[PDB]
Amino acid sequence: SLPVTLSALDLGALLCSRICHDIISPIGAINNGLELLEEGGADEDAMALIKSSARNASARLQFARIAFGAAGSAGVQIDTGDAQNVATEYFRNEKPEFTWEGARVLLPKNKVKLLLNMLLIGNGAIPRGGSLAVRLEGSDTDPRFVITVKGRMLRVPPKFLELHSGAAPEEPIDAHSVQPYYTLLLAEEAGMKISIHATAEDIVFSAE
């Protein structure tokens, strides 16, 4: 169970800090690219930066709409096919090879918010790249989520391991560690436990 509890003012402020940070990066890169065109010399290089950053701003906005922004009762259900679409588009410009396996089902919103948030933990697990494989098991009424990571560098993101294990962090939560915290908080609210198993070849994050 979670070793620290963030007030509503704190969770809200940190979550927004995190979204702004992640979407500002491509948006800022876009403006930089536009500034380079009001000069000259790098016109084809600038345009390519503008185009990919725009595609990425959009992918990050779509992902955040569901992973952070979705709201309403557990009756507002979400289709994992929609999760797979925003996830696949998010991961185009991320480092790992991203694959998705499992039949489309409708789950309560908090379960799919969990799922997308675990992908971020997964992405942090293999910071120099590798593969991130999603597998949806079970039924719509008790699903199991399996995120399997492989890569040359391979870890559990330290703040995530710390919070998952019940130890109260030396450092205070910030817009970085808020996402692992948020992930654990979603899992409690959704009635699922996250598990972390390591082998020689991979790490498996699972929830059920």
């Binding site: 990066s25 380079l36 010399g41 790098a42 930066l49 990425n56 410009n93 942090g124 910071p127 560098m153």
Partner: protein, 120 residues
Amino acid sequence: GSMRVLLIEDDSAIAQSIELMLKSESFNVYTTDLGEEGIDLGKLYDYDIILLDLNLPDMSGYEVLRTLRLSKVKTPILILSGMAGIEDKVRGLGFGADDYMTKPFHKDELIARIHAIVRR
């Protein structure tokens, strides 16, 4: 004899942004996306300035900083953050950074701070 810049950055949209901007002013830019390589390149070669992100995968930006200064690298280090806050700048100054900037920034600002810091 152009200006040499070590860029230690992981968010590839920012890195490409900084590369394009700097290279359009004839700077040489050597970028890495891992702090532990940043610590090695900064310990071993000569740069006019090191642009350093706080947000790095294999360690904190601050560890890159703190290790470079503990190893007595005198190369001026400009820190970049996507995460605003006065507290971050001051901690940076405490660890031996020359200056601090938040994303996003315009080309004019980055270039102006680089000259100001380096003095050429």
